[PDB]
Amino acid sequence: ADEALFLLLHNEMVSGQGEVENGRCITKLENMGFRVGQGLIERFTKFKDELDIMKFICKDFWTTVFKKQIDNLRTNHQGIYVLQDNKFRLLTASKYLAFTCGLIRGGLSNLGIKSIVTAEVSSMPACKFQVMIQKL
Amino acid sequence: SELFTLTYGALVTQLCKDYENDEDVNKQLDKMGFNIGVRLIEDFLARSNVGRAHDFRETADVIAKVAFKMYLGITPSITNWSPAGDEFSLILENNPLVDFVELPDNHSSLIYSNLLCGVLRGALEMVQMAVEAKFVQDTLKGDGVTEIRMRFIRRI
Numbered sequence: 001a002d003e004a005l006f007l008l009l010h011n012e013m014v015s016g017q018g019e020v021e022n023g024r025c026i027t028k029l030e031n032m033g034f035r036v037g038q039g040l041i042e043r044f045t046k047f048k049d050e051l052d053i054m055k056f057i058c059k060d061f062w063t064t065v066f067k068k069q070i071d072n073l074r075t076n077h078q079g080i081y082v083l084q085d086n087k088f089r090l091l092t093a094s095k096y097l098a099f100t101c102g103l104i105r106g107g108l109s110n111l112g113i114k115s116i117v118t119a120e121v122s123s124m125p126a127c128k129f130q131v132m133i134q135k136l
Numbered sequence: 137s138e139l140f141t142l143t144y145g146a147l148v149t150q151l152c153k154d155y156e157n158d159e160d161v162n163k164q165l166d167k168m169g170f171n172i173g174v175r176l177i178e179d180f181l182a183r184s185n186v187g188r189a190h191d192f193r194e195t196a197d198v199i200a201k202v203a204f205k206m207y208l209g210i211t212p213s214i215t216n217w218s219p220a221g222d223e224f225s226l227i228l229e230n231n232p233l234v235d236f237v238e239l240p241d242n243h244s245s246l247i248y249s250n251l252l253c254g255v256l257r258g259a260l261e262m263v264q265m266a267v268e269a270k271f272v273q274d275t276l277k278g279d280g281v282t283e284i285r286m287r288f289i290r291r292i
């Protein structure tokens with residue numbers, strides 16, 4: 001499937017209530033992303049380190065989805081990572097990052113890591129995804 | 137692309153949770169497809185030099201041989217032309233967007249790839265053709281082939 005189809009579908013999903021319903025929508029976007037992230041690892045990857053797993057997300061995983069690597073990886077060495085993409089493809093605001101938060105969480109989950117993943121537009125079209133690794 | 141296939145499968149799964157009945161799922165899939173197709177046509181026309189199709193027969197060829205190839209990497213065969221040239225079928229060897237269905241069946245009325253029918257209608261509306269697209273066979277429904285039947289209704 002040509003890349004245009006995913007880009008159009010994602011855009012159509014994000015555009016189509018009250019704060020509760022809106023919240024439910026975000027959660028649905030993230031959850032769909034989670035399932036897709038899992039299935040991508042399942043197909044792609046048949047990792048002696050957490051740092052290795054994060055490197056893979058930034059390299060192979062981001063390339064599989066967005067055809068480029070993450071621009072910056074930062075850590076506090078206490079379980080938080082920040083992944084920076086200087087030109088997030090699904091932008092060219094918060095709504096547009098939710099599915100990708102799930103992609104990351106689902107990809108990590110299939111590699112044995114539980115995480116909470118959130119994101120912000122740092123400065124359009126740059127975005128930062130925060131990955132908080134969970135002990136359980 | 138697994139990416140598109142997996143994303144579309146997740147969508148269908150979520151819609152089925154949202155809606156009590158599959159007819160509402162079908163309607164929503166079609167709507168989303170229509171909206172996608174409206175955008176897809178501008179992508180398609182910018183990427184190919186198809187000329188312009190001066191009938192439904194030439195349009196069929198463009199859809200089957202060029203557009204499906206570009207977006208899905210597949211070439212459906214065109215069959216079953218009405219004598220009046222306003223109806224034809226796209227035949228596929230499986231379901232183009234969905235690989236598997238869950239057993240036991242809880243979604244007999246679900247048209248798994250109904251989004252594709254919306255895409256087709258929406259993209260053709262933008263070239264001034266009112267059409268109808270409809271699955272009349274589906275391998276996922278136990279048919280020998282998958283068949284999308286295309287009808288030309290009016291010029292816009």
Ligand SMILES: CCCCCCCCCCCCCCCC(=O)O
Binds near residue numbers: 176204255
């Ligand atoms: C969800 C999968 C999308 C793939 C669908 C491929 C069909 C898209 C239709 C666009 C082709 C339109 C052809 C008519 C253009 C013309 O008259 O020159």
